[PDB]
Design a binder for this molecule. Structure first.
Ligand SMILES: CCCCCCCCCCCCCCCCCC(=O)OC[C@H](COP(=O)(O)O[C@@H]1[C@H](O)[C@H](O)[C@@H](O)[C@H](O)[C@H]1O)OC(=O)CCCCCCCCCCCCCCCCC
Ligand SMILES: CCCCCCCCCCCCCCCCCC(=O)OC[C@H](COP(=O)(O)O[C@@H]1[C@H](O)[C@H](O)[C@@H](O)[C@H](O)[C@H]1O)OC(=O)CCCCCCCCCCCCCCCCC
Ligand SMILES: CCCCCCCCCCCCCC(=O)OC[C@@H](O)COP(=O)(O)O
Ligand SMILES: CCCCCCCCCCCCCC(=O)OC[C@@H](O)COP(=O)(O)O
Ligand code: NA
Ligand code: NA
Lengths: 301, 298, 301, 298
């Protein structure tokens, strides 16, 4: 069940592909929970909370190196203690980013997923590989004498900080919150974004055709003006370069009614219904997270 | 049952008017649901995937042609050739939809009553096609309203793509849920909110003596602004009794922005909590009607 | 009525006092529910749709104060078709207001009500009487050579405009929807308004005490600046001349977190769960309101 | 049951730490409930109404003296003499609360764990008293930080009236509901959203090259402003890769405004739909302890 050198119940159930029907109810078994929870309070938490500190320090050094970037590259090293700190910090952030890149490649070679929607499945590792990729593509451009390295560095800085949530596991309520938001993005945000993108683009495509000329005669500008409504900034007077105010006002009011007053509230209702439906489901998938984490550190050491 | 050439239960349950108590639920029996989901997996799903592709390309061509309209119509180079070809193809799609709507009306020959309670999609497409034709005739009639009817036709046409979201279980249910919310909750909210909006706008306009919003339209727009989190609360100072103005503005906000606006969320939540089952059944019926529509086309 | 007149069954159960334990399931009695349903459409509904039209036309005859209001009253007659319309509309509105005043007084005398649960229950007629009182004091202000008549009549117009929601009843969905807005303003909007007022008064008092001098040194100005956060307009830097920024920023963030991020969402959740609990009782109370409304038409026709 | 001067079941329930498995449901029994309600109605209730009146009067006196403070402290007129006596009466109230907190801390002999897990109300009062005392010290110590201390104390004093909402069934349930929501939902949301906001602020500031939005504080405030529905999306233009700037803003907005806040509104709704009995039982415990405390006071 725990150690066999060939195959173990914990290994097959924790590492089981999603195709298994009850992979979330195959771990509540009395001995399996007592063993996994033991392993959680035995080693895996000691390796999960020491590694958490290491990653936090890595992200604090990576944000120190990025913020203090000097203003084409590469650059020289000024004789200053601050410059030395910056140079060691960026060298250490790049090293960590190539370490994550190797960990991801090892994960791909070893587990060998079936090229079947592996983006929703084990999405934590694919995100960590995207961050390592953002760091190593920020390294080659920087040595290639181009300023797109900063665009890449801000994206790697914005990918690491948001992915910090990976360590929310090990804490019951905080893990249940993380898994609940994750599946909510995979469900409520995806559908709402599809329909909202259709309405926003179409209503913004009808305005830009109606508008004659000006700062807002571009499709991008009109889309931005139309989007400003969702964030409580709708102006309703941003342009007067049109022959027909009735046609503009009718279109803008229709867009507001269709999106702001109907879709957002209907989304808040759907999020309430979904939240009321999945307490047990979110506990069982959270139980699958910590359980895999237990075996992951049990194999790391 | 499915091919009898006299009367098919599939057609009887599908083309039944809203009168029938159990037009949605009766289709879930072992034979009807399994026969329709099969028809979807046989010669409807892929016939509906190509049709949607064609309608997406048509909508892209119509947007590209309209987005570049030159500035009293009617109005050589590769760009102008492409623009005129796109305009012609857009007109050709509009007229095709117009004949399709006419054919639907003549065949189904509605009872004069279900055209407003059933198949909102057909009515929505016919109105889009009518806007398109009004935009053609006005364009050839030496008038600039051709661009007003055109932008409305494009705004309605872009919104009509939700008709094709059926064929997908989650997105179809999503569309049916939007349809029901708009029909019930948005209608009630709009009635009660409009009564409030009008009453307090007429009250504020009356308070103002001589200013920039004396016009009822400007003040109505100002009071509507508060609903989208862009309210001013100090838009005017050219009046007397500042206490009366501020009290009137604080009364309105609470009754709508802080009471009826949040009331729309609770009712939406209640409804969504109650209409999952019927929303799935209606999607199934829309899918079954599309299946029998794809079969009768031949 | 179940065969009795002096104290008819449907008369007493409809005109029951507040202290009655279960008045809500009285008119729903199948027989008593078919007394105000077979009679509902008999005549009272025809006299309730005519009265609704008569009140709408009355309201609109006075809602055009934009067109009427001249720029030290009383005023002169301009000898035109517009001024004639204005004066006849004013007279008609003043007469209808007197009519609603005399109706309210005649209700207070005939019913000799408790006038303590008359503001929580049967509060509709209280609002109508308030509308009639504001009209009366508007006429006296206009005749007493004062400019406060414009404020009184503008409050009366808004008071009578909100009251149209009374005649919104008679339709099952709309009346029960107004019943939910009626019971949600009594309980939830009261409790939230009481806790938000204490919070907003306290933080405004702290902010104005911190502010050293400026156009916002007034308590009223700072209170308004603090309130503007609720409607999605918070500036977070409205003042400049105040105590060291160290204290002004922390106070504003605390106010935002406590009021915008916490109490409005708490109000939404509370009105969601309440809406989930109040279907049958909202239908029954709507039935009680129609039973009394049509009983009033039965006694007045 | 009432008092044996060594141990009574009433004091046993009221003074036991939160460690007890079911300290909230013990008062639900008939005898304890009826006896505690009767005691309340008899005297404790009238004793709690006068006590709140005194606090309301006190807060106003201190507030009035603080609002009209003269503008190098420290510092013959009816206003000045009123302002100096109000300050004296405010300093006298702060001292009284200080001594009450010390007495409650020395009597309960807290085990240093439930001190910051329970009696949150007792803790809030001692903190507002400490700021008042440090305000007096600074005032007489020739410093201008007494204003900062006084405004903090004034804010806490105005927000602490929620301690006198107990004694009222609806205002007591609402106040415990707000307590539990702040204890769990607000804290978890704040943790996650602070992580997000720090990440995206550090990404945006690292994208800018120079300007008055180059500092972390201003750019962090700018990113925070989106949550209150007053976002800009065009706050700065002194940088490169406008695509990178707009993508980073649109990702932050999608993550926080349209996903995190609604997520919080759903979780809140769940908890409210779940806590009714616990909130009622905790308010009853706040009321029973109050009756027991009034009996102990004299
Ligand atoms: C007059 C038009 C009023 C449109 C308001 C309602 C919008 C809406 O509910 O859906 C509309 C429709 C989906 O109903 P359907 O026809 O399929 O359902 C019916 C019927 O109800 C039942 O279910 C079955 O018999 C079977 O399903 C079918 O018989 O088609 C869409 O989904 C696109 C609608 C997209 C939203 C736009 C609606 C309003 C038009 C926007 C105008 C823009 C102006 C610029
Ligand atoms: C540390 C400072 C922060 C404290 C946490 C916030 C506390 C809060 O919010 O609950 C209101 C609180 C009531 O706690 P209680 O004592 O009743 O807790 C109970 C009680 O002790 C009893 O044992 C059992 O019920 C149970 O075991 C126990 O849990 O205190 C009030 O009575 C309202 C006061 C409301 C003020 C609190 C909000 C903070 C204001 C910030 C002002 C900033 C100014 C700048
Ligand atoms: C490449 C995207 C744009 C880059 C610039 C902006 C930064 C956007 C960051 C998007 C990723 C954040 C969303 C996300 O997916 O977070 C996951 C975290 O919960 C980690 O928890 P877990 O381990 O996966 O359980
Ligand atoms: C004097 C204060 C400002 C006066 C301005 C008048 C407009 C401000 C709002 C007045 C009160 C709003 C509440 C209200 O008027 O609702 C009543 C409706 O439910 C009527 O329906 P119903 O009879 O109760 O069923
Ligand atoms: Na806003
Ligand atoms: Na807003």
């Amino acid at each position: 069940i725990d150690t066999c050198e060939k195959n173990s119940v914990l290994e097959v159930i924790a590492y089981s592909s999603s195709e298994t029907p009850n992979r979330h109810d195959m771990l509540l078994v009395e001995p399996l929970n007592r063993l996994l929870q033991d392993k959680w309070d035995r080693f895996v938490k000691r390796i999960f909370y020491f590694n958490f500190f290491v990653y936090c320090l890595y992200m604090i050094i990576f944000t120190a190196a990025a913020y203090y970037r000097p203003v084409l590259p590469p650059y020289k090293l000024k004789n200053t203690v601050g410059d030395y700190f910056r140079v060691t910090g960026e060298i250490l952030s790049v090293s960590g980013g190539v370490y994550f890149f190797f960990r991801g490649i090892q994960y791909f070679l070893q587990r060998r997923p079936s090229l079947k929607s592996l983006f929703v499945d084990s999405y934590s590792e694919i995100l960590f590989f995207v961050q390592s990729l953002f760091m190593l593509v920020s390294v080659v451009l920087y040595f290639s004498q181009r300023k797109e390295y900063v665009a890449s560095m801000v994206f790697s800085l914005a990918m690491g900080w948001t992915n910090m949530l990976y360590y929310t596991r090990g804490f019951q309520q905080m893990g249940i919150y993380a898994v609940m938001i994750e599946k909510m993005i995979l469900r409520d945000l995806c559908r709402f974004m599809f329909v909202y993108l259709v309405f926003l683009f179409g209503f913004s495509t009808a305005v830009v055709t109606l508008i004659e000329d000006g700062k807002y005669n571009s499709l991008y500008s009109t889309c931005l003006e139309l989007f400003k409504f969702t964030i409580g900034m709708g102006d309703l007077e941003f342009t007067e370069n049109y022959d027909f105010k009735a046609v503009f006002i009718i279109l803008l009011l229709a867009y507001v009614i269709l999106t702001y007053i109907l879709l957002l509230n209907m989304l808040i209702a759907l999020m309430g219904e979904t939240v009321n439906k999945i307490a047990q489901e979110s506990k069982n998938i959270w139980k699958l997270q910590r359980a895999i984490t237990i075996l992951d550190t049990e194999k790391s050491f």
